[PDB]
Scaffold this active site. Structure first.
Site, PDB file in Angstrom:
ATOM      1  N   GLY A 162       0.791  -1.220   0.000  1.00  0.00           N
ATOM      2  CA  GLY A 162       0.000   0.000   0.000  1.00  0.00           C
ATOM      3  C   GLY A 162       0.826   1.273   0.000  1.00  0.00           C
ATOM      4  N   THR A 189       1.612   3.295  -2.330  1.00  0.00           N
ATOM      5  CA  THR A 189       1.172   4.369  -3.210  1.00  0.00           C
ATOM      6  C   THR A 189      -0.062   5.086  -2.695  1.00  0.00           C
ATOM      7  OG1 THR A 189       0.057   2.735  -4.587  1.00  0.00           O
ATOM      8  CG2 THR A 189       2.289   3.457  -5.267  1.00  0.00           C
ATOM      9  N   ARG A 228       3.017   5.371 -10.240  1.00  0.00           N
ATOM     10  CA  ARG A 228       2.361   5.949  -9.070  1.00  0.00           C
ATOM     11  C   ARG A 228       3.329   6.229  -7.928  1.00  0.00           C
ATOM     12  NH1 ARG A 228      -3.159   5.886  -9.341  1.00  0.00           N
ATOM     13  NH2 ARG A 228      -3.379   5.786  -7.058  1.00  0.00           N
ATOM     14  N   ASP A 260       0.632  -7.591  -7.676  1.00  0.00           N
ATOM     15  CA  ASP A 260      -0.693  -7.465  -7.064  1.00  0.00           C
ATOM     16  C   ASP A 260      -0.663  -8.243  -5.754  1.00  0.00           C
ATOM     17  OD1 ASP A 260      -3.624  -7.770  -6.535  1.00  0.00           O
ATOM     18  OD2 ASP A 260      -3.916  -6.964  -8.548  1.00  0.00           O
ATOM     19  N   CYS A 285      -2.477  -1.688   9.319  1.00  0.00           N
ATOM     20  CA  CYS A 285      -3.506  -0.692   9.553  1.00  0.00           C
ATOM     21  C   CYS A 285      -4.884  -1.227   9.161  1.00  0.00           C
ATOM     22  CB  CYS A 285      -3.179   0.516   8.689  1.00  0.00           C
ATOM     23  SG  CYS A 285      -4.225   1.946   9.045  1.00  0.00           S
ATOM     24  N   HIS A 340     -11.806  -5.291   6.908  1.00  0.00           N
ATOM     25  CA  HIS A 340     -10.806  -4.987   7.936  1.00  0.00           C
ATOM     26  C   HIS A 340     -10.885  -5.986   9.078  1.00  0.00           C
ATOM     27  CE1 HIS A 340     -10.340  -0.438   6.888  1.00  0.00           C
ATOM     28  NE2 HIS A 340      -9.347  -1.139   6.367  1.00  0.00           N
ATOM     29  N   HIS A 374      -9.986   9.168  11.953  1.00  0.00           N
ATOM     30  CA  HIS A 374      -9.887   9.887  10.690  1.00  0.00           C
ATOM     31  C   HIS A 374      -8.435  10.241  10.393  1.00  0.00           C
ATOM     32  CE1 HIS A 374     -10.554  12.872   7.586  1.00  0.00           C
ATOM     33  NE2 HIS A 374      -9.896  13.758   8.312  1.00  0.00           N
ATOM     34  N   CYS A 406       6.647   1.327  15.469  1.00  0.00           N
ATOM     35  CA  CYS A 406       6.310  -0.045  15.856  1.00  0.00           C
ATOM     36  C   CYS A 406       7.380  -1.041  15.455  1.00  0.00           C
ATOM     37  CB  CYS A 406       4.964  -0.468  15.257  1.00  0.00           C
ATOM     38  SG  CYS A 406       3.579   0.418  16.013  1.00  0.00           S
TER      39      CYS A 406
HETATM   40  N1  NAP Z   1      -9.673   8.455   7.317  1.00  0.00           N
HETATM   41  C1  NAP Z   1      -9.415   7.340   6.444  1.00  0.00           C
HETATM   42  O1  NAP Z   1      -9.323   7.464   5.246  1.00  0.00           O
HETATM   43  C2  NAP Z   1      -9.207   6.056   7.169  1.00  0.00           C
HETATM   44  C3  NAP Z   1      -9.440   6.033   8.508  1.00  0.00           C
HETATM   45  C4  NAP Z   1      -9.238   4.878   9.192  1.00  0.00           C
HETATM   46  C5  NAP Z   1      -8.766   3.758   8.497  1.00  0.00           C
HETATM   47  N2  NAP Z   1      -8.549   3.791   7.156  1.00  0.00           N
HETATM   48  C6  NAP Z   1      -8.049   2.597   6.497  1.00  0.00           C
HETATM   49  O2  NAP Z   1      -6.461   2.801   6.534  1.00  0.00           O
HETATM   50  C7  NAP Z   1      -5.927   2.078   5.557  1.00  0.00           C
HETATM   51  C8  NAP Z   1      -4.976   2.998   4.752  1.00  0.00           C
HETATM   52  O3  NAP Z   1      -5.801   4.037   4.228  1.00  0.00           O
HETATM   53  P1  NAP Z   1      -5.208   5.009   3.037  1.00  0.00           P
HETATM   54  O4  NAP Z   1      -6.177   6.150   2.784  1.00  0.00           O
HETATM   55  O5  NAP Z   1      -3.850   5.546   3.382  1.00  0.00           O
HETATM   56  O6  NAP Z   1      -5.130   3.984   1.767  1.00  0.00           O
HETATM   57  P2  NAP Z   1      -5.346   4.362   0.161  1.00  0.00           P
HETATM   58  O7  NAP Z   1      -4.957   5.864  -0.062  1.00  0.00           O
HETATM   59  O8  NAP Z   1      -6.783   3.955  -0.210  1.00  0.00           O
HETATM   60  O9  NAP Z   1      -4.260   3.334  -0.555  1.00  0.00           O
HETATM   61  C9  NAP Z   1      -4.552   1.959  -0.517  1.00  0.00           C
HETATM   62  C10 NAP Z   1      -3.252   1.237  -0.919  1.00  0.00           C
HETATM   63  O10 NAP Z   1      -3.507  -0.079  -1.084  1.00  0.00           O
HETATM   64  C11 NAP Z   1      -2.995  -0.452  -2.537  1.00  0.00           C
HETATM   65  N3  NAP Z   1      -3.809  -1.513  -3.056  1.00  0.00           N
HETATM   66  C12 NAP Z   1      -5.148  -1.649  -3.188  1.00  0.00           C
HETATM   67  N4  NAP Z   1      -5.417  -2.839  -3.787  1.00  0.00           N
HETATM   68  C13 NAP Z   1      -4.229  -3.433  -4.030  1.00  0.00           C
HETATM   69  C14 NAP Z   1      -3.955  -4.643  -4.627  1.00  0.00           C
HETATM   70  N5  NAP Z   1      -4.847  -5.607  -5.151  1.00  0.00           N
HETATM   71  N6  NAP Z   1      -2.675  -5.062  -4.769  1.00  0.00           N
HETATM   72  C15 NAP Z   1      -1.648  -4.275  -4.341  1.00  0.00           C
HETATM   73  N7  NAP Z   1      -1.928  -3.064  -3.735  1.00  0.00           N
HETATM   74  C16 NAP Z   1      -3.225  -2.643  -3.600  1.00  0.00           C
HETATM   75  C17 NAP Z   1      -3.227   0.684  -3.205  1.00  0.00           C
HETATM   76  O11 NAP Z   1      -2.473   0.627  -4.489  1.00  0.00           O
HETATM   77  P3  NAP Z   1      -2.866   1.521  -5.820  1.00  0.00           P
HETATM   78  O12 NAP Z   1      -2.190   2.862  -5.772  1.00  0.00           O
HETATM   79  O13 NAP Z   1      -2.366   0.692  -6.973  1.00  0.00           O
HETATM   80  O14 NAP Z   1      -4.400   1.754  -5.897  1.00  0.00           O
HETATM   81  C18 NAP Z   1      -2.735   1.805  -2.277  1.00  0.00           C
HETATM   82  O15 NAP Z   1      -1.362   1.844  -2.346  1.00  0.00           O
HETATM   83  C19 NAP Z   1      -7.102   1.622   4.700  1.00  0.00           C
HETATM   84  O16 NAP Z   1      -7.299   0.276   4.881  1.00  0.00           O
HETATM   85  C20 NAP Z   1      -8.301   2.493   5.219  1.00  0.00           C
HETATM   86  O17 NAP Z   1      -9.576   1.790   5.010  1.00  0.00           O
HETATM   87  C21 NAP Z   1      -8.735   4.931   6.466  1.00  0.00           C
HETATM   88  C1  TEI Z   2     -13.602   9.258  12.923  1.00  0.00           C
HETATM   89  C2  TEI Z   2     -13.389   7.893  12.267  1.00  0.00           C
HETATM   90  N1  TEI Z   2     -13.210   7.702  10.748  1.00  0.00           N
HETATM   91  C3  TEI Z   2     -13.009   6.332  10.467  1.00  0.00           C
HETATM   92  C4  TEI Z   2     -12.864   5.879   9.166  1.00  0.00           C
HETATM   93  C5  TEI Z   2     -12.972   6.797   8.118  1.00  0.00           C
HETATM   94  C6  TEI Z   2     -12.873   6.388   6.795  1.00  0.00           C
HETATM   95  C7  TEI Z   2     -12.685   5.041   6.544  1.00  0.00           C
HETATM   96  O1  TEI Z   2     -12.568   4.492   5.260  1.00  0.00           O
HETATM   97  C8  TEI Z   2     -12.253   5.377   4.233  1.00  0.00           C
HETATM   98  C9  TEI Z   2     -12.974   4.881   2.982  1.00  0.00           C
HETATM   99  C10 TEI Z   2     -12.680   5.838   1.830  1.00  0.00           C
HETATM  100  C11 TEI Z   2     -12.562   3.441   2.653  1.00  0.00           C
HETATM  101  C12 TEI Z   2     -12.603   4.149   7.584  1.00  0.00           C
HETATM  102  C13 TEI Z   2     -12.397   2.717   7.166  1.00  0.00           C
HETATM  103  N2  TEI Z   2     -12.247   1.681   6.772  1.00  0.00           N
HETATM  104  C14 TEI Z   2     -12.689   4.537   8.902  1.00  0.00           C
HETATM  105  S1  TEI Z   2     -13.066   5.529  11.806  1.00  0.00           S
HETATM  106  C15 TEI Z   2     -13.305   6.593  12.893  1.00  0.00           C
HETATM  107  C16 TEI Z   2     -13.460   6.346  14.389  1.00  0.00           C
HETATM  108  O2  TEI Z   2     -13.378   7.296  15.219  1.00  0.00           O
HETATM  109  O3  TEI Z   2     -13.726   5.181  14.788  1.00  0.00           O
END
Ligand code: NAP
Ligand code: TEI
Ligand code: NAP
Ligand code: TEI
EC number: 1.5.1.30
Lengths: 207, 206
Positions: B10, B12, B39, B54, B109, B132, B153, B188
């Site tokens: 992940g 990118t 990317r 992949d 994550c 997840h 967030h 970590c």
């Molecule tokens: N506020 C939020 O957005 C939030 C909050 C809490 C938790 N999360 C979770 O935190 C984690 C990280 O979030 P993020 O926003 O930083 O992630 P992101 O910007 O959506 O990036 C996802 C990464 O996973 C890669 N990926 C997806 N499918 C793949 C595949 N089949 N093979 C290889 N690589 C693949 C993507 O590659 P590509 O560039 O090729 O697409 C990208 O590098 C996520 O699981 C998200 O659900 C997000």
């Molecule tokens: C405030 C708050 N935001 C959360 C959050 C936000 C966006 C998310 O996904 C992004 C989407 C584009 C896939 C995911 C997940 N998975 C989780 S969790 C949380 C908390 O407080 O528990």
């Protein structure tokens, strides 16, 4: 002589949308609205120039609404429903994509003054909606578009005054704005660049 | 013990890019698995090794995990709003590869929704959250040294290094900057204190 003349309004059937629509038609704007099929504008009220029936969660419907506009006003919300939701942030993602694809730059979009609050002070009952406003603001800020972030305090039913305070990038001196004044400010943001890239908190003391 | 070589999955993504940059600046020898190398940024800190492939292809994952000291997982499927198994199937491939190559440490994550009541999850985020949870179970059941990182967030505020880490529960703030989250993923790697725990990084920015 209107530099901005064609506008899309998202959320025109809502509390602030209805008065924003009314004021925009009176001011000479050519207004396009996106309305959900079950929730059309009231028949006795002002009529926009163009109606798209559909959903902000469908890219195709948002595209049809944004095409050919000068600017976009966003007054999406969940009415009285405080449930967890992504309708505003996902709707904003679609709006951003359509604006980029169609060459529209100006977006004036309403979230809430809680985005200027100490986040641990937001009332828990409002946190789920606030979380989506936070997601929506991030989508719009990261878009690169000319984005005016309108972050109002409590929206009331007081008059249109045009006399409200606009506080830049912080909380203002009153804790209310009337829905009519909020809509007036959304339209004012179409006629100037001074708020682009800023957060704005409109507020007033009704007396 | 001392971690020098890491794979990032992940890399990118939003958090991935800054975790990668910070890891390269700090001296890690980083291998990334990317579906499209364009990317990755052309300038600045660049990873030592790029595998094009992949996470759903076990052979690609095996090639990425070979020879590493630890693995960071920042996979996501942003657009999926209905049942999806990319992250959990990727995690199964990662676990098999770590076992086959004797890699013992994984920092992955998911999200703080796993620390809240399920009714807090917006309907359109339920499918990602369900996967997840599946990914978390895959990693917990693996027997590997696993730090579960469950952020709220993810914001864009500048790196501070000053955030709070809450163990096995939630802390007071509900935002972590993507830069601070990446900084924490790397922290970590330097300690065993979070192994077998859930971790909630959060901070107050202003
Ligand atoms: N506020 C939020 O957005 C939030 C909050 C809490 C938790 N999360 C979770 O935190 C984690 C990280 O979030 P993020 O926003 O930083 O992630 P992101 O910007 O959506 O990036 C996802 C990464 O996973 C890669 N990926 C997806 N499918 C793949 C595949 N089949 N093979 C290889 N690589 C693949 C993507 O590659 P590509 O560039 O090729 O697409 C990208 O590098 C996520 O699981 C998200 O659900 C997000
Ligand atoms: C405030 C708050 N935001 C959360 C959050 C936000 C966006 C998310 O996904 C992004 C989407 C584009 C896939 C995911 C997940 N998975 C989780 S969790 C949380 C908390 O407080 O528990
Ligand atoms: N109430 C306050 O004191 C206060 C204070 C600060 C900020 N805010 C926020 O200010 C914003 C505006 O509030 P408001 O009271 O004017 O709005 P509202 O009365 O809640 O109206 C919401 C509008 O959004 C439309 N909408 C919702 N989902 C849609 C969808 N899927 N597709 C297309 N349109 C959709 C609604 O259409 P339908 O007619 O089909 O429902 C309606 O037009 C909200 O985001 C609110 O949270 C409120
Ligand atoms: C005094 C004061 N009231 C605020 C307020 C009130 C109700 C709200 O939502 C109600 C729900 C039905 C959407 C929202 C939002 N979003 C924000 S903010 C604020 C301040 O002082 O900044």
């Amino acid at each position: 002589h209107m530099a901005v003349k064609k506008i899309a309004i998202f959320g025109a059937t809502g509390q602030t949308g209805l008065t924003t629509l009314a004021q925009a038609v009176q001011a000479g704007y050519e207004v396009t609205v996106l309305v959900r099929d079950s929730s059309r504008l009231p028949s006795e009220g002002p009529r926009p120039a163009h109606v798209v029936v559909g959903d902000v969660l469908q890219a195709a419907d948002v595209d049809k609404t944004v095409a050919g506009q000068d600017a976009v006003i966003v007054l999406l919300g969940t009415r009285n429903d405080l449930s967890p939701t992504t309708v505003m942030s996902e709707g904003a993602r679609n709006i951003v994509a359509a604006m980029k694809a169609h060459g529209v730059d100006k977006v004036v979009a309403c979230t809430s003054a809680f985005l200027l609050w100490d986040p641990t002070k937001v009332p828990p009952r409002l946190q789920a909606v606030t979380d989506d406003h936070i997601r929506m603001h991030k989508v719009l800020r990261e878009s690169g578009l000319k984005y005016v972030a309108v972050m109002p305090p409590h929206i009331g039913d007081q008059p249109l005054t045009g006399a409200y305070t606009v506080t830049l990038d912080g909380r203002g001196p009153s804790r209310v704005i009337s829905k009519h004044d909020l809509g007036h400010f959304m339209l004012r943001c179409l006629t100037t660049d001074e708020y682009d890239g800023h957060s704005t908190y409109p507020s007033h003391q009704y007396q």
